């Protein structure tokens, strides 16, 4: 009962150390940069075939094939160029809230309210997709899952934990603990040596894949954090929460860099992604549309409207050619 | 144009046909979301069904009068209910189970859960079937202990009928949206057929009112 004093002292020292480093501000540094233009993005494609709310999507590493998960109990693999359905996978549990697509493209993953991460093998000799693995051990719903190197996968759960698995054996190689609320999303670093998890305790944590330790903790939000992504450089990241503000933090300075908010916007944020160069920030909102922010000036550069319900999933191709957004009206749209 | 892309398009069209057929088959089934406060007779209601491995959500299928019902039990989640309740926005009905024999202020927790569920922004115009289990234990306890121990405002006799009616009214008075949704109440009895018949009647009424909304008659 005497250790709370030491914890408060360490927290105050950390806050003062962060204060000492704030010699300038990103906005007053980049105000001299000429602003990016008013952006029009056109809907090149619309993918139909889902009969319920689409909860997750992920792009292939070739930036042509994508996977979408919908609570009609379906995983659909689309060829975006021709809007063809390569594969349709029926799930044992209709309550799917996440999906991933392997970097090699051999497997896909899904999970949800069944606390089990199912891994499906796309390339089989029998000509059909069959369940390759069912990783179990989480005591809450799966919120996100990301493939590392086609044999291990990182998952986050609603029991305030994350876990790194071993698909070959099915055992939790590592368990990341330290969050207080449910972990809603994780983002994988470009080198796949670190990752960031945002939780419902209005905090984000930077875990190291090896040693299973939390290196930095970032606060500043006022509500549940729903989405997270890395800057393409890998030295900064962005978060979206329920208080209708995005935030951009950096790893090296260990504190916030910028906030993206507008007086008109009051609904929460579901999805967040960057651009290929990192100049633009795509954010999906509950008010049925998407917003493109200038990552260096915090001014809204564009609006992507055309979804009749909450925009739940959003992704940008590896080559940066297109942006795919999916909402609760059971449609995915490719924008360019 | 297309050399062997015609075969790819034909495969896509067969996929579309199978998806449409599966959606049609799934659209003729009833969805019930089973909710309760601390396992207050939920299992007994589940036992009326006739037809660590998993811990997230439990499925229960049954058929009554050729109609197929699927019941979803989410009692083993123990996480933020606000982060996954919106998944059940389109269920045909909710089935809320409450134990009448209540002992440490459990009825107050049950009412708090009922208030949080009925007045949720996702469950507008979604009907609730309220089961009040353990009527015989309620009889015995109300014979022994008075209802004032839970409700200081109560000013009625210790008779089973008046106490049960007061509890039912106390639960039904938490419904703010008295117009767009309805609450069906049934004191659960030992007979197996009665509970399923009551659920079938409530679901039939819900389907009828949904059809009136879709037909433009409201």
């Amino acid at each position, epitope marked *: 009962d005497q250790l709370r004093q030491e914890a408060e002292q360490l927290k105050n020292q950390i806050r003062d150390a962060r204060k000492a480093c704030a010699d300038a501000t990103l906005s007053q540094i980049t105000n001299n940069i000429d602003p990016v233009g008013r952006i029009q993005m056109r809907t090149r494609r619309t993918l139909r075939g889902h009969l319920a709310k689409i909860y997750a999507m992920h792009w292939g590493t070739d930036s042509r094939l994508l996977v979408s998960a919908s609570q009609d109990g379906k995983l659909i693999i689309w060829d975006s160029y021709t809007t063809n359905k390569v594969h349709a996978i029926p799930l044992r549990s209709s309550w799917v809230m996440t999906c991933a697509y392997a970097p090699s493209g051999n497997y896909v993953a899904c999970g949800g309210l069944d606390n089990i991460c199912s891994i499906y093998n796309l390339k089989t000799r*029998e*000509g*059909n997709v069959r369940v390759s693995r069912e990783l179990a051990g989480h005591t809450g719903y799966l919120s996100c899952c990301r493939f590392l190197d086609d044999n291990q996968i990182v998952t986050s759960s609603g029991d305030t934990t994350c876990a790194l698995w071993d698909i070959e054996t099915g055992q939790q190689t590592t368990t990341f603990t330290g969050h207080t609320g449910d972990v809603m999303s994780l983002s994988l670093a470009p080198d796949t040596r670190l990752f960031v998890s945002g939780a419902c305790d209005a905090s984000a944590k930077l875990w190291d894949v090896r040693e299973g330790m939390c290196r930095q903790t970032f606060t500043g939000h006022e509500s549940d954090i729903n989405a997270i992504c890395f800057f393409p450089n890998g030295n900064a990241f962005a978060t979206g929460s329920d208080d209708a503000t995005c935030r951009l933090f950096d790893l090296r300075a260990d504190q916030e860099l910028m906030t993206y908010s507008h007086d008109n916007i009051i609904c929460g944020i579901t999805s967040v992604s960057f651009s290929k160069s990192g100049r633009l920030l795509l954010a999906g909102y509950d008010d049925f549309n998407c917003n493109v922010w200038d990552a260096l000036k915090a001014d809204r550069a564009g609006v992507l409207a055309g979804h009749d319900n909450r925009v739940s999933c959003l992704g940008v191709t590896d080559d940066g050619m297109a942006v795919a957004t999916g909402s609760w009206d059971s449609f995915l749209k490719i924008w360019n | 144009l297309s*050399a*062997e892309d015609k*075969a*790819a398009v*034909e*495969r896509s069209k067969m996929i579309d046909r199978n998806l449409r057929e599966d959606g049609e088959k799934a659209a003729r089934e009833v969805k019930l979301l089973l909710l309760g406060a601390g396992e207050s007779g939920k299992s007994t209601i589940v036992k009326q069904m006739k037809i660590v491995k998993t811990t997230g959500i439990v499925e229960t299928h049954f058929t009554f009068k050729d109609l197929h019902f699927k019941m979803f039990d989410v009692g083993a989640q123990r996480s933020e209910r606000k982060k996954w309740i919106h998944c059940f926005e389109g269920v045909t009905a909710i089935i809320f189970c409450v134990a009448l024999s209540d002992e440490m202020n459990r009825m107050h927790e049950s009412m708090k859960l009922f208030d949080s569920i009925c007045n949720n922004k996702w469950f507008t115009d979604t009907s609730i079937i309220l089961f009040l289990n353990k009527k015989d234990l309620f009889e015995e306890k109300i014979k022994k202990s008075p209802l004032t121990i839970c409700y200081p405002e109560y000013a009625g006799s210790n008779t089973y009928e008046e106490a049960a009616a007061y509890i039912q009214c106390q639960f039904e008075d938490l419904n703010k949206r008295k117009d767009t949704k309805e609450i069906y109440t049934h004191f659960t009895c030992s007979t197996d057929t009665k509970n399923v018949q009551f659920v079938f009647d409530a679901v039939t009424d819900v389907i009828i009112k949904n059809n009136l909304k879709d037909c433009g008659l409201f």
Partner: single-chain antibody, 232 residues
Framework: VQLVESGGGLVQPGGSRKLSCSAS????????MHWVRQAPEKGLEWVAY????????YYADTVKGRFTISRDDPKNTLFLQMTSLRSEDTAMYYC??????????????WGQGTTLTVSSSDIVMTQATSSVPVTPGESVSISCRSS???????????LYWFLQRPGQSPQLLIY???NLASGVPDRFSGSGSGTAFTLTISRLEAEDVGVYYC?????????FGAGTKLEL
């Protein structure tokens, strides 16, 4: 996975037969099916194709009208009902599966073939070389040439390389002129441009000999061209 053929034998001219192809070990309903023909001591020759779900059916010009391909999916069987048998239909018949989506490998598995004996095509592809003497320590190049540009407007060149070992059925080596089939040693490679294509073997072994064929999959007649023989 295996395809097993039945129904061969000796037939008088003008008769009729029905060849059967039983498939086990894979999802038969998802694969389109081909009947291919090989005359005695001659090259391969495409005969018939039936889609998945029996949607589209294609026949060769020389067998159209007197042949009929069909499938029965509940029993996983493929039938070729042939009538008005001439003396030019004596050959061995192979049953080939082929599934088409983005990034698939059609023609990957071939059946064993059944022998049928009878008693008394705007794209032509030429393999000018007929035989090559080799030793199991060098690199071999086999050239194929087309009468049309196999490159399509979507960036895909539709050329397939098959290998037939002595006494066996052909196996897919390369699909779409660049991609190695599953379970093929890395020593094989393919390249080309539009109308001239090349197969390259870096270091041969005792099992690299046989007859090599280059098929086209641009226009559906699906001509083959006489293969190139590698021996010694």
């Amino acid at each position: 996975v295996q395809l097993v053929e039945s129904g061969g034998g000796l037939v008088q001219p003008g008769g009729s037969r029905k060849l059967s192809c039983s498939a086990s070990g894979f999802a038969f309903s998802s694969f389109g099916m081909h009947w291919v023909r090989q005359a005695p001591e001659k090259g391969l020759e495409w005969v018939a194709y039936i889609s998945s779900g029996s949607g589209t059916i294609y026949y060769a010009d020389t067998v159209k009208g007197r042949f009929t391909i069909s499938r029965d999916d509940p029993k996983n069987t493929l039938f070729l009902q042939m009538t008005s048998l001439r003396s030019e239909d004596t050959a061995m018949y192979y049953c080939v599966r082929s599934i088409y989506y983005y990034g698939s490998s059609p023609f990957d598995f071939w059946g064993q073939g059944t022998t049928l004996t009878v008693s008394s095509s705007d794209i032509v592809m030429t393999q000018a070389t007929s035989s090559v003497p080799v030793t199991p320590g060098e690199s071999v190049s086999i050239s194929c040439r087309s009468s049309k540009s196999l490159l399509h407007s979507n960036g895909n060149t539709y050329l397939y390389w098959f290998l037939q070992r002595p006494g066996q059925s052909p196996q897919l080596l390369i699909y779409r002129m660049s991609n190695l089939a599953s379970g093929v040693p890395d020593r094989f490679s393919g390249s080309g441009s539009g109308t001239a294509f090349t197969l390259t073997i870096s270091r041969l072994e005792a099992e690299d000999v046989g007859v090599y064929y280059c098929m086209q999959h641009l226009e559906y007649p699906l001509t083959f061209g006489a293969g190139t023989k590698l021996e010694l």
